[PDB]
What does this fold into?
Amino acid sequence: MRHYEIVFMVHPDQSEQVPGMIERYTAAITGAEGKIHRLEDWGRRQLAYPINKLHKAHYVLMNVEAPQEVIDELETTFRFNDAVIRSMVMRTKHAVTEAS
Amino acid sequence: SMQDPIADMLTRIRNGQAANKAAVTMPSSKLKVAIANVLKEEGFIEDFKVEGDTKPELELTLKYFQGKAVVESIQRVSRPGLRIYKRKDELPKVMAGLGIAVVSTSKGVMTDRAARQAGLGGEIICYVA
Amino acid sequence: SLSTEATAKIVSEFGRDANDTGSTEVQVALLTAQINHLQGHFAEHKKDHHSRRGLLRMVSQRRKLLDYLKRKDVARYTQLIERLGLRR
Amino acid sequence: IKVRENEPFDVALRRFKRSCEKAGVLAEVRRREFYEKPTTERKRAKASAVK
Amino acid sequence: EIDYKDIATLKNYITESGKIVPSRITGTRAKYQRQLARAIKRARYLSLLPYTDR
RNA sequence: GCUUGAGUCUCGUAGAGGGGGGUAGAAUUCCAGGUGUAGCGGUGAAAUGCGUAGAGAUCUGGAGGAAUACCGGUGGCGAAGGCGGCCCCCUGGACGAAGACUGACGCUCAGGUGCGAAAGCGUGGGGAGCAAACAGGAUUAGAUACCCUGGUAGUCCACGCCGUAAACGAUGUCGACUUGGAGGUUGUGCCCUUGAGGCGUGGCUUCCGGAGCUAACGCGUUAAGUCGACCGCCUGGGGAGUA
RNA sequence: AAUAUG
It folds into this structure.
């Protein structure tokens, strides 16, 4: 299977809904097949430049093995979700801890 | 591809003489050795020697003169892509007879000097000067 | 490239004893299964001419190999072309 | 970007920006047309830099 | 190695405007510079480090 | 029959390889609105133009299409054309490493077939800049040019067509051999590893050069050296790559 | 700046 290095950035303001979002995301991936080797929810973090004058938004990284389906349904959930801004998914990584 | 290894071997000779290396290595074969025997017979090379089974390597020791190459020139007369025959009543020669050609006759690979006395024509191979 | 599971399957399948990769029968099947798999890739797109070169590279080579097995033996050739299913 | 000098900065003598690249980077896109242009530029500069 | 999440390090290879320091300067070798520049654009994309301020 | 050629498997490397789709910053202009007031713009020198009907200027937002600064290199990759934001999906090839198997399956190829920048054409979209045409103002003996202000087709996209370029290293392709240096670029084994190190070995590639060759200029282990295999093409210039 | 012909 393919290891994916996913990262997304979610609204500062919605941080009380954040743990609810982290549970529903990682459930939908790991229910199918997926297996967490890094999951991190960074907390607030002031931006290097302010994206459309937004500020301090939360960073959320993952490293998961996944089938091609659930990363698609995650990416389309990122295109869906209007409380989430920028998103990336990247190559294998092969399991990591901290360095944030 | 290595279309003719025989003209290659003679070219490795003429390159070897120009670069002034005594030992020249090449893959062995039957007529190559028989040509190397004609070279040693005529006396323009010192000796050949061979090693292999799966991949033979003929190693031919070329002579040198006191202040010169032993070989003046060496050329493939009947080219791979065009085979040329000369009969008993007229056989070619090199440098007014002083040099030799190499000729494959029915009775084998000879020089022109021996082949004219031997009295049969055939395929000329190369001019050793 | 074709799958590792496909390569390790086909060598035991169309081959003889173990390790029979180099022999023509596996080769023809491997190139054909590659060509069939690439048939979907060129089903969509049709602008990728250099990818089509990588297709056409397998096509003539498999075809030339087939001429080799033909000149060696017609019975294995005719039996091979029928089992895979090719050649008008 | 800008000067941001310490407390005794005198009559605005820009220590930082005088060291900076200034109007070189400003000129760099400026110069009229570009699309065909730098094809002959390559290597001829670099070829000069030998001992 | 060449992670974009190396943002503590990648500051050394940017000037005040956020422009990249080239391969002549940095003590790198040609491979690691390509991975570095690639990582910097990824870091730039997420606003972990900046494309440029202004 | 055999294995060094060739082909192929296993494990990797590098990379603007290709298409397809989504998505970003950054920059210009327009559009709408706020503050602010006689110049602005443009030139070697000026005028046409724009501006008190509030411009240019400045500020805030929006709209729209393009192109990817920086890093980027006398770097990379691709048959050639050519390809520089980000990410994914599909997907091409070269090279290394050890090890394995097939066993001449090769090399070249007229006819034939495919690909093939820019311009241009067909149909329907899109059009921020720029820019043939074309207009006007300058220059000039003349200026339908250079110069300057505007500005349409086109430049953009989909799907078709055109098959041409100094499509050039002005080097046909393939293979063997023949002194080198100083580099670049990229894999990998050996070693006291103390090092952004040391001793090696392969592929590609740049500059300088030996014999040699060449009419000279220069080319020169990537040959325009020394040889073989095959294919193309040439026979005064102009008339003509025209009838 | 700008400068034509023998």
